[PDB]
Structure formats: structure tokens, C-alpha cells
Design a protein around this ligand. Structure first.
Ligand SMILES: Cc1cc2nc(NC(C)C)c(N3CCN(Cc4ccc(F)cc4F)CC3)nc2cn1
Ligand code: NA
Length: 353
């Protein structure tokens, strides 16, 4: 398709309908499903709305780039594409802090600070994304004799470059947070083993002592280890330790040890529970990793070409950089369905009349 410019367009022309359609479906499910009202999925919905504007913007671009009322309207549509890109990258960052903050300390991840911040994230996102998309309609265009146009007219090279430079820095920070997220998950997975080691060491030393105090020390060091596992990623175990502790103090070494050995019944069920949650956390973080990789891999080529390209360069270099960026909004709805089970359930929920 090197010499085929319009066939490059027709590929994107109908692809905008797909991107507009599929995202329009996702935004509905988040809005129409209470289980998806959690901050994670609300922020994902914003990305869908951002990816939604991408499909609408280019659809109206072709509809107006070919037999439109006027070109000034086409200068609004480019704002939609600008607005979508800012609304997509901005919200994509927002999902990262939600993951980091949620994993960093869920107890501090309360329904007050979080839900408050969530509305500001979307508000601070779209108020800026739209604002950037509206700047061209206030003079930030390239249709002047003293302004050089970019690969995507009427956007000027000066302004697309600032967006490109801003995008690199924003994407550079999102990578840093993802590592911090990993550090959080690693740390949450590290202190857990220490509690398990101390918890098991305490159980064993309980048997290897004939003093009623050695039992108290191990249980006290055991209760603290049990408690530390709760503050990390927020009953019967500690409750049974309390019952075990209640016996140790009042001279019940023989029977207090018996209660310590029933903890294994709960502890075996207690340990088997935490492992699954980290599996859910890793996949949730893993899905975050995949999304970030696709976003950059599909937008970065355009981010560079719009700054280092020349108007003496062929057009195929333009679409070759827009094609991944355009279809990036088509792929984002697909990723969550195949990875995130909570939203995938609603997708296959509708099965028959
Ligand atoms: C036929 C056609 C389709 C276009 N489809 C655009 N969008 C799609 C890829 C969602 C698009 N936009 C314009 C706004 N732009 C913002 C931007 C993004 C990154 C960057 F480094 C610098 C920037 F200025 C994104 C691409 N222009 C187009 C021009 N003609
Ligand atoms: Na996107």
C-alpha cells in the first residue's frame, strides 16, 4: 500500500467505526454494571471513552475531509484526535496510580480518599484532554504563513512536538510506577514468607519447651506475625490464637499446645487463601504491563515521525505510523476481555434470548 493513499484511508475509515463501536460497548458495561463501578474499572472506562473519541474523530474526519461543510470543521475533528490521545494517555497513567495505591496499602486505600481522587483523575483528565483538543480552534494551528505544518494538518510541528515530548516524559514515568508496583507486590510477597517462617518456627518451639512462658512468647510472636499479614493486603486464625493464648496464661500448657496444633487446620486453609490473591494481583499487574507495552509500541512511532519527518517524505511513512496508533484503540478493548475475568463475565453473560 505504498502508493495507495486512499486505500490507506479506507482501511482507517471503517476501522474508526469498529473502534467507536467496540468502545461504545465497553463504556456501557462499566456504566450499567455495579460490579464494574470499582475505581479500577471506572478508570478503564475513561480510557474506552478516550479510545471511543478516537473512532469518532477519524470517522468525522473522513466524512468531512471528503465533502464537508468547511475545513474549519476539520480543524475541530483534529482536536478530537488530539483530545482522544491526551485522554487515553492521561487515563492510562491514572490506572497505574490506582494499581500502585491499591497495592501499596489497601487499608489506606479507603473508599473516601480513593473515590474522591478517582473523580478528580477523570475530571483532571478530560478537562485537560479536551482543552488540548480545543487549543487548535483558538489559534494553535499551522495554517499561517509563519508556521510550518506537521504530518497531521492543521497541527503545527511546534505543537505536535510538545505533545510528543510531553508523551515521552509521561510514558517514562508510567514505567517507573509499574516498577514501584512490582516492588510493592514483591514486598507484599516477601514479608509474607517471613511471617510464615516465624509462624512455623513459633509452632515448633512451642512443642520444644516445658515452661508455660515459652508457649506465651511463641504465641505472642505468632499473633504479631498473623497480624502483620492483615495490614499488608486487607480472623479465625488470630481468634483461635486468642483462644490458644487465653489458655497459655492460666496454666494450661498441655491443653494450650493442643489448641496451637488445631491452628494448622485453619492455617492450612489460611495459607491456601493468600496465594490465590497474589495470583489475581500478578495477573492484574501483568495485564497492566501488556497494555502499557502495546500503547507505546503503537503510539511511539508516530510520536517520533511527527518530529523527525520531512514534508519531502512519502505518505506511506505517515499511515505506517498512524496505522498502529489507530488500531491501538481497537486492540485495547480486546486485551481486558481475554485477561480480566471480572469484565469478561459480563461479555459472555448475554447468551440467549
Ligand atoms: C487521516 C488522518 C487520521 C488521523 N488520525 C489521528 N489519530 C488516530 C491515530 C487516533 C490523528 N491524530 C492527530 C492528533 N495527534 C496528537 C499527537 C499524538 C502524539 C504525538 F506525539 C503528537 C501529537 F500531536 C494524534 C494523531 N491524525 C490523523 C490525521 N489524518
Ligand atoms: Na489508546
Amino acid at each position: 500500500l505504498l502508493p495507495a493513499v486512499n486505500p490507506w484511508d479506507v482501511l482507517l475509515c471503517v476501522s474508526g467505526t469498529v473502534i467507536a463501536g467496540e468502545n461504545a460497548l465497553v463504556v456501557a458495561l462499566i456504566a450499567s454494571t455495579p460490579a464494574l463501578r470499582t475505581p479500577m474499572f471506572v478508570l478503564v472506562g475513561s480510557l474506552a471513552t478516550a479510545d471511543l473519541l478516537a473512532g469518532l474523530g477519524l470517522i468525522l474526519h473522513f466524512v468531512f475531509q471528503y465533502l464537508v461543510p468547511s475545513e474549519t470543521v476539520s480543524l475541530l475533528t483534529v482536536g478530537f484526535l488530539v483530545a482522544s490521545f491526551a485522554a487515553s494517555v492521561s487515563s492510562l497513567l491514572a490506572i497505574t496510580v490506582d494499581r500502585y495505591l491499591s497495592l501499596y496499602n489497601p487499608l489506606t486505600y479507603y473508599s473516601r480518599r480513593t473515590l474522591l481522587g478517582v473523580h478528580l483523575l477523570l475530571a483532571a483528565t478530560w478537562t485537560v484532554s479536551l482543552g488540548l483538543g480545543l487549543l487548535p480552534v483558538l489559534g494553535w494551528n499551522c495554517l499561517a504563513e509563519r508556521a510550518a505544518c506537521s504530518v497531521v494538518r492543521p497541527l503545527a510541528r511546534s505543537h505536535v512536538a510538545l505533545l510528543s515530548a510531553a508523551f515521552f516524559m509521561v510514558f517514562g514515568i508510567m514505567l517507573h510506577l509499574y516498577v514501584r508496583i512490582c516492588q510493592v507486590v514483591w514486598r507484599h510477597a516477601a514479608d509474607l514468607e517471613d511471617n510464615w517462617e516465624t509462624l512455623n518456627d513459633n509452632l515448633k518451639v512451642i512443642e520444644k519447651a516445658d515452661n508455660a512462658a515459652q508457649v506465651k512468647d511463641a504465641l505472642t510472636k505468632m499473633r504479631a506475625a498473623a497480624l502483620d499479614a492483615q495490614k499488608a493486603t486487607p480472623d479465625i486464625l488470630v481468634g483461635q490464637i486468642d483462644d490458644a493464648l487465653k489458655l497459655a496464661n492460666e496454666g494450661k500448657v498441655k491443653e494450650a499446645q493442643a489448641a496451637a496444633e488445631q491452628l494448622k487446620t485453619t492455617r492450612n486453609a489460611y495459607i491456601q487463601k493468600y496465594l490465590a490473591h497474589l495470583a489475581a494481583t500478578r495477573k492484574g499487574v501483568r495485564t497492566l504491563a501488556v497494555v502499557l507495552g502495546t500503547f507505546g509500541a503503537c503510539w511511539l512511532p508516530f510520536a517520533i515521525y511527527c518530529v523527525v519527518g520531512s514534508h519531502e517524505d512519502p505518505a506511506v511513512y505517515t499511515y505506517a505510523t498512524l496505522l498502529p496508533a489507530t488500531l491501538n484503540s481497537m486492540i485495547n478493548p480486546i486485551i481486558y476481555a481475554f485477561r480480566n475475568q471480572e469484565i469478561q463475565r459480563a461479555l459472555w453473560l448475554l447468551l440467549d434470548g
